[PDB]
Amino acid sequence: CGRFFQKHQGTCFYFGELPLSLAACTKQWDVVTYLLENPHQPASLEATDSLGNTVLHALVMIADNSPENSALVIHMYDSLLQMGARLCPTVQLED
Amino acid sequence: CGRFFQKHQGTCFYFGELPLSLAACTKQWDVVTYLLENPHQPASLEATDSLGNTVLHALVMIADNSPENSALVIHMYDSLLQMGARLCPTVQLEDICNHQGLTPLKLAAKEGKIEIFRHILQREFSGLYQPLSRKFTEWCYGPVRVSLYDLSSVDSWEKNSVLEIIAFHCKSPHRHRMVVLEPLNKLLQEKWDRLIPRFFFNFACYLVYMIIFTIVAYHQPSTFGDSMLLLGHILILLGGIYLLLGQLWYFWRRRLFIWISFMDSYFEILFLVQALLTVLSQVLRFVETEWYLPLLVSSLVLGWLNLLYYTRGFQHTGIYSVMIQKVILRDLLRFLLVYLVFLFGFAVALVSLSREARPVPYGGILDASLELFKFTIGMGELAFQEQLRFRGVVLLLLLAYVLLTYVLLLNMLIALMSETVNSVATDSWSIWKLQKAISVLEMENGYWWCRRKRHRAGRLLKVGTKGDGIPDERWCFRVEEVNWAAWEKTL
Amino acid sequence: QALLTVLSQVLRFVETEWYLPLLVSSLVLGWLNLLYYTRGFQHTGIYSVMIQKVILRDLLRFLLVYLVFLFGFAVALVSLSREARPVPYGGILDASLELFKFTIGMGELAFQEQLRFRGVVLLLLLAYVLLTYVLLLNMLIALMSETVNSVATDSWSIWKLQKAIS
Ligand SMILES: CC(C)CCC[C@@H](C)[C@H]1CC[C@H]2[C@@H]3CC=C4C[C@@H](O)CC[C@]4(C)[C@H]3CC[C@]12C
Ligand SMILES: CC(C)CCC[C@@H](C)[C@H]1CC[C@H]2[C@@H]3CC=C4C[C@@H](O)CC[C@]4(C)[C@H]3CC[C@]12C
């Protein structure tokens, strides 16, 4: 929760201020997985930041109306939804 | 140094009149090298010709705005710069002064070559040639990147900068496209945002001056009121002399500009004329003449018309003003020529007849001309006058004039205005940006009585290390961009 | 419109001298607002959207330039033409109205001879005519043409959004 990582005008980049959301927002589909089957301390997927935003909220924040960013956001959204299907079936992330 | 190898009009080809420059200009990247490692007599790379032009100047002169020549010039420029890095590291080729006092960047700016100018303005290298770069890329945290553009010889703080060259020296047909590109864009926007208060303060001062002018002109004859009127008269005199002095200082310190570009400013002339008329009328009231009020009201009209100078400053209205200028210059003068020819012919014809009785209409040339011009404003009389012996000839002539001038010519003028507006809808924005750049460059200076304190643009950063000593630090301009395309191509 | 109507109705009990102006202003505003229901049909709703776009895009700046020109020329004509060799161009409002008559194709352009500066008046009037009626209004027509050609595709979506709001 630093001035650079919040949503404002100027020097900023909001990614959800969470390591899982940070990895998801950077098209790093190798470490996002590893945060989910690390046997020692698993990373919760329904975890929210100080702004009340979860990983999907962070993804939809960073979405621009560009052909190259929209594809990234869509693919990460779909893949992470399928990933969360196998981890937390009793709770739905869309709500 | 022969007539064929100099820069003139006709049969000529200027290549720098030097064997090294000749080889470089012909895409001969086999012999240009050989001139540099021949053991017997090496060829100096900082060698200049009789025109004060080095090899880099020769390269930039032969540059045309063509996709096939621009690539050649750019590649030779970059390759020769890298080659000279390994031969002469203690000297910098980019800062070789011409006989006219120009550098390759400044020479590109003045000659209007836009492709090589843009490439030189932002060029980046990968490895050993970091110092030979203008645009640097600092920390790429995620998809946001900060670009530092070199502000050497392009920031207006220097005496002869690139911004001033484009504004006041470039004679190119389209020099408004060189003012909107990268690190020539953002810098001007920042300067305008910082100079807005001064611009609107000048606007307010001029508005107050014309309010005083209108009050004085409206309340003059053919006490407290008399004292206020005298104060207004003297205030107008000093205001007019101030405007005249400012315009004279402008034309003194910018004497050439009237020949490089008449069409681009065209308000300094109007301000000068208005100030001249005002001061002349004020010094003409002491003569107690009869031609005072005409010139006074002419200056009153001209100033209120010139008030549209400050219409610039807003995109919506500035682009409208630019389009107004384009419409006036493009499809109004020839219409006026044809209209005056038709009007004069028909007016003379109507005056020639209609004096043979079977006051009098169409008595003279001016009367008939006015009666015919009334048709344009939808007020022409088209009666069947019966006092004349040739009523039918008059009616037929009037009908011919009406169908030939009011139905055809004015509607065709409307169509021409429509197509002109559709044609110049994209360059007007660049023209407005160039006008803003000129206004900013003028406002950076002070006045003819007080020179403003100059302000550095750009921050000092940490660029890198030179190959001679240690730190080689330069003033840079920082710009952030949220770009995902570049971030895709770095995984 | 509702505020004007209720205020005028509560102003009739006071027997106020300014009842009829507000009453007729509300009468105009209601009939103008009747074009709210013009939307509801595609052909007329898109026309209303285009009318709004034209008003917002290329009518206000024309009005600014026109008022600047009109004020300058009206003040100029009022300043002179009071030197005899009623009286035309007696005041600012009279001269402004006479100059605005040119726009609606009703301006008088005679060579008045009672004035000492008839030539200056005629030249000024001609300059105003060529600078405002030949150039500016035709350029307005051209600007509306290009604006209509520019917004011919988004107006349908704007009308759909208006229907969604309704
Ligand atoms: C120069 C002296 C003799 C006056 C005659 C020229 C004046 C009256 C005419 C000639 C060309 C005209 C100008 C042409 C271009 C522009 C720019 C536009 O954005 C506003 C109108 C404006 C400013 C016109 C105002 C009237 C104008 C200045
Ligand atoms: C607001 C009070 C003071 C009245 C002044 C504003 C009125 C008279 C003017 C200003 C803007 C104008 C409106 C601009 C837009 C539209 C939408 C169009 O589809 C029909 C005409 C209509 C409805 C115009 C009617 C007249 C109008 C409403």
From Swiss-Prot, chain A:
Q: Identify the stretches annotated as ANK repeats.
A: 15-50, 51-95
Modified after translation how?
N-glycosylated.
Cellular localization per UniProt: Cell membrane; Cytoplasm; Melanosome
Annotated coiled-coil positions are none
The free-text tissue note of the record is: Abundantly expressed in spleen, placenta, skeleton muscle, lung and brain.
> What this chain does, per the record?
Calcium-permeable, non-selective cation channel with an outward rectification. Seems to be regulated, at least in part, by IGF1, PDGF and neuropeptide head activator. May transduce physical stimuli in mast cells. Activated by temperatures higher than 52 degrees Celsius; is not activated by vanilloids and acidic pH.
Record's subunit section: Homotetramer. Interacts with a cAMP-dependent protein kinase type II regulatory subunit (PRKAR2A or PRKAR2B) and ACBD3. Interacts with SLC50A1; the interaction probably occurs intracellularly and depends on TRPV2 N-glycosylation.
Family stated for the protein in its record: Belongs to the transient receptor (TC 1.A.4) family. TrpV subfamily. TRPV2 sub-subfamily.
Q: What is this protein called?
A: Transient receptor potential cation channel subfamily V member 2
Which residues of the parent chain are present? 190 to 284 of 756
